[PDB]
Amino acid sequence: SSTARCSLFGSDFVNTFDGSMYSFAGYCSYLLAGGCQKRSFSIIGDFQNGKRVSLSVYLGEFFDIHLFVNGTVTQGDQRVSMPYASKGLYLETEAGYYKLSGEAYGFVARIDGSGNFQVLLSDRYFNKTCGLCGNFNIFAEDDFMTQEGTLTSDPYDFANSWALSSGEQWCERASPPSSSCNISSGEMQKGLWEQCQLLKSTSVFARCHPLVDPEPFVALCEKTLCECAGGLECACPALLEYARTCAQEGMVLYGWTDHSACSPVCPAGMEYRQCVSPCARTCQSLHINEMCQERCVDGCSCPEGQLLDEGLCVESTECPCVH
Amino acid sequence: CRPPMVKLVCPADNLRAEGLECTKTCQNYDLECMSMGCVSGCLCPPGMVRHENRCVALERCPCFHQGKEYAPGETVKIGCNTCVCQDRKWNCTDHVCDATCSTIGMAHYLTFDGLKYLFPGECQYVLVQDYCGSNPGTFRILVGNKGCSHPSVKCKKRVTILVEGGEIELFDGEVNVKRPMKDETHFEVVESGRYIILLLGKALSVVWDRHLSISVVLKQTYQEKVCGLCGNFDGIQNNDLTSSNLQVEEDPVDFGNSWKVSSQCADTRKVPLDSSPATCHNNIMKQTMVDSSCRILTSDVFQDCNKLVDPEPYLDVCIYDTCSCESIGDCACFCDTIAAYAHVCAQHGKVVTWRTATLCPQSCEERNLRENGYECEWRYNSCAPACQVTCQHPEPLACPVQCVEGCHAHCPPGKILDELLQTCVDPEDCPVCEVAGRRFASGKKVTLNPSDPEHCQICHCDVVNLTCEACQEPG
Amino acid sequence: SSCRILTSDVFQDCNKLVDPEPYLDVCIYDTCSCESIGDCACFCDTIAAYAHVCAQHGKVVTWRTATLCPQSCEERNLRENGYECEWRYNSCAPACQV
Amino acid sequence: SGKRYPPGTSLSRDCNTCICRNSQWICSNEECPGECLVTGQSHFKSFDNRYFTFSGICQYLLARDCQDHSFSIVIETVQCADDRDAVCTRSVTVRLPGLHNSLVKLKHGAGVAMDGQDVQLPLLKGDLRIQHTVTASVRLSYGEDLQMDWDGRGRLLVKLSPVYAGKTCGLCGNYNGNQGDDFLTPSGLAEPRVEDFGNAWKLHGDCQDLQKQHSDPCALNPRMTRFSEEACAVLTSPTFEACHRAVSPLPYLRNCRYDVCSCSDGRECLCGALASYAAACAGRGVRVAWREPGRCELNCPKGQVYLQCGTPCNLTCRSLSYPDEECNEACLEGCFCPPGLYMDERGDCVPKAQCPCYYDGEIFQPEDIFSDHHTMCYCEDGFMHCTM
Ligand SMILES: *[C@@H]1O[C@H](CO)[C@@H](O)[C@H](O)[C@H]1NC(C)=O
Ligand SMILES: *[C@@H]1O[C@H](CO)[C@@H](O)[C@H](O)[C@H]1NC(C)=O
Ligand SMILES: *[C@@H]1O[C@H](CO)[C@@H](O)[C@H](O)[C@H]1NC(C)=O
């Protein structure tokens, strides 16, 4: 393994380093990962109202980056362009997805097109980090070590413990939102319950069951098939997180988006591949092979030809020059 | 509940039902406790107390210090004072120990009684003197800095000391006499390691690292008879800022300007108080790189000493100096602040080896290469004795410093060092003297017995000569 | 003035064969930006580079003293229980030996 | 302090005088009253003016009389935020062996209890008086050698007079004039570490022993390094220029940066730390105006108003019913209303014609004619004009 994975997917949902799911409609900034004895870094997640806005990384007390979902990035208050490489951190874009690599410090953070956050973290932090993504032992029953040092059962008085205020933010406690699904239901639920069920039935998902259970994944989707409207794409966030999990555990799974009827969003020209290499030969790259022997990565990339040139796809014949 | 203790219940007789709540153990036996009632638990008998889950049958339970257990009769050494626990409390001596000034870095001073303060100056200042109030007085030690309001590769210190009509001063890594003093017997110099140790009497001494650190050492003899930037040596720490005009100041920068020697030089300015001195001000990264390098004071090799000596004072100096100091080729405004703490650690018995090849190297190979053949006797030491025997000073001396850093010579026994020749040599080749048989120094150029003219049998010795001059009759 | 050591008395033999002005531009650039605290290395490595070039043109140079870039070598003799004393710092010694 | 003074002047260091003669000051050396201070999260000042921070969670002994046993003060600490470095004082208990061996408990809401029973103030028992204060605080006063202040939100003070010099022991120290022996533990021996010192004065064994006293809680919340550094730079600014000369700022600057980075609401930790310094300056004599709409101007109620320096002598409606009592107070800060208006039971400051009388414990109304077979009385204007 050698690494871990936390994920903050869908609306309000979280997946810890050890396989614990829980919703959290936060209203302010919260700690995701970082040492609990000595912090060389701290990954932080800012919300506006329930919905998420930014991922932040502070290095002790001297340096700060704030990548948003809208695309903007800022070192402190000054907005900066992208890419960016300062202080051992490479803020780049891999496979259409923004990346913040800190391999010196031992982490990789990326946000996708739908806004879902993700944090990969080294084994040099096993039982050595605690936060909203919990600790990194193997056990999932103890992912709620509060900041006071105590266990918990409510996900909120746990996650409210990790709130990190600022001079400008000054944030309050968060509560479970009202459930308007017990009243709003009927023929929708009977038909919409199906999309959560295929995680079990369909052959493509029917072989990660020894790797990970869909039981907590079907549980979290069914409570979100009730508020939305006009489609069946409300179940696919849970479905995508299941794929990304099984891949990290060492079983990549192909072609599950052909019939699922939920394409993950990506910009013009590129479509969602699964297992593309991060070092896609672009138009102004050196033909330097057998060096990018990194793990295969999920994401979107250009067609078979149609190389990349400044955030679009263009045929190789129209490759420009630079001076 | 278990046999070794007896159960308790709340009596309705009295509100004072002190039980399981006020559970008397060792460290809270003498102390006072609240109680709103009992917990109706099972508590030890009246004749014993809890300890580490064991209801230790006697009131002989340990006598803690530094979070460590001491059975009765065990002893500890704090300073020059042994101390022992008789019943349940430590029982220390009352021998007052020897005190020590210090110039930790460029602009900081540690008093005798123990008080770090910030005073950057560029004039000449009184560091310590006995000419204070109603005392007749014997000595007057001064310190003169130049270009040292801002710690940097500037700030060379000059030190003049006035004792017995003498004037021996020092700068540029050397000692220079300007007026020899009368009682030359007490004068004594010891050039051992990185240091010039310098003895001046039964109760006075100076220790200088040839660059910045001034550590004058005094004894019980004075005991509220001195004053200056180092204070008065009375045990009280709150009165070390009593100025020349006989009042205490709240601000150290107004204290030191009271002790300048020339009234017409500049008063150093009140700096506005900031944690980020000069160059750490706007650059928060260089304020973090300096800390993490200065957090070596709280490191694995110092953990033994961090228990005896607080590193937080010496950490404040490590940040102040090398923020202001721009180090290019001589990383010395950092390595000298850490050698100071290690010197203090060694005086409390904790020898320390903190110095490697990529951090403050301190080579010593030059004192072996000047010889045509590389004889290889000089070696750097963590902390070696400063008081040893040589061709010059063969006798044992008053040793105010147990050990010191630096390049120490070593060759097998039966061979004695000289400083004129970098190498060592057998004893008989030293220019040592023994006139009429008795053991004394290496023919010290001293007039022995001016006291009794009739018994005046004067005998000097230049290098080896078995000589005796005649005493000029007063008649 | 610290980087004017490149134009100093011990380098005069090499200043005739190799211009020091390039290596002086690097000595100013590096240790201006570099904040040196405990490891004076962003200065001592720029001067060891010029001395290495000087030695390749036959001009061996001894510029290194105890208060300027010391470079001790006593650790490779102390790890032995007895201080056998065979390792010594050398201005410029053969890299190709047996 | 870098200021010229002519010969024959007479300065005062708030306890002692100093007269200039022949360029030297002749100074008196009488002993001075002590002040041990608890404030902030876990920031302490000894009687002999040693400053330290000890974040322990237990019931600690703060001050005791240690040759006789005229009193003992015990302090109860708790973790006061999500951060582990935030440890505030919740309550303080007091023991008077001279009076029934009574046990007073000052509570977190500025309340007070004596042996369990909550009490309506004032409480003029024989020796001890407990009354409220201009700031909704509480002041205990046993005799004339012991004062205290509020442990509502955790700012206990204690005034001890010179008759207790060198005969007290606890976290506050010996009160002997020396700062160096203030880490003196109950075994008659001084410890160099603050962690080991405080863990020796705990009263309970179930409690934990603090292994580590930190100094930079901004490392665990790195989002507050900018606010903490910029918000208490006002303390080293020229807004407080008049008492940098009277009391050193740099510890109060060190306590602010620990509190704002550690506590839940740094609105009040910021404006409780700056008020800690202002109260120290005022204790010397320097009154300061550091309040602003931004820097925490408190909102006095409808009738009342902020007042930098007042007098608690003629304000309350109880003072008119008790004129022959004296007001040996100082010029205090707080919330008053203009002088013609006097406070009431329900905190409404009204004229002296609607001022009740607080005679014989009871309270009467502005024109209650009471009478008996051996006296007659009438409450006219706050004073009850009794006769026989
Ligand atoms: C959304 O993107 C815009 C683009 O400039 C940026 O100004 C903004 O701050 C982003 N949203 C939030 C909540 O910051
Ligand atoms: C995790 O660290 C804690 C704190 O030291 C320790 O008590 C515990 O045993 C560790 N757990 C594992 C799985 O190593
Ligand atoms: C301590 O030692 C002294 C030594 O004279 C002795 O007289 C005394 O009784 C002992 N007890 C204490 C704790 O004073």
Ligand SMILES: *[C@@H]1O[C@H](CO)[C@@H](O)[C@H](O)[C@H]1NC(C)=O
């Ligand atoms: C340093 O000196 C001590 C005491 O003489 C000795 O035991 C130790 O081996 C020496 N080490 C070095 C580095 O010379």
Ligand SMILES: *[C@@H]1O[C@H](CO)[C@@H](O)[C@H](O)[C@H]1NC(C)=O
């Ligand atoms: C020893 O002293 C005598 C004086 O009697 C003198 O003549 C002789 O030169 C001296 N010897 C040396 C070696 O100085």
Ligand SMILES: *[C@@H]1O[C@H](CO)[C@@H](O)[C@H](O)[C@H]1NC(C)=O
């Ligand atoms: C190493 O230095 C010495 C002295 O400069 C020199 O004699 C020797 O030739 C150098 N190295 C070798 C072995 O060539």
Ligand SMILES: [Ca+2]
């Ligand atoms: Ca876990």
Ligand SMILES: [Ca+2]
């Ligand atoms: Ca003193």
Ligand SMILES: [Ca+2]
């Ligand atoms: Ca004391």
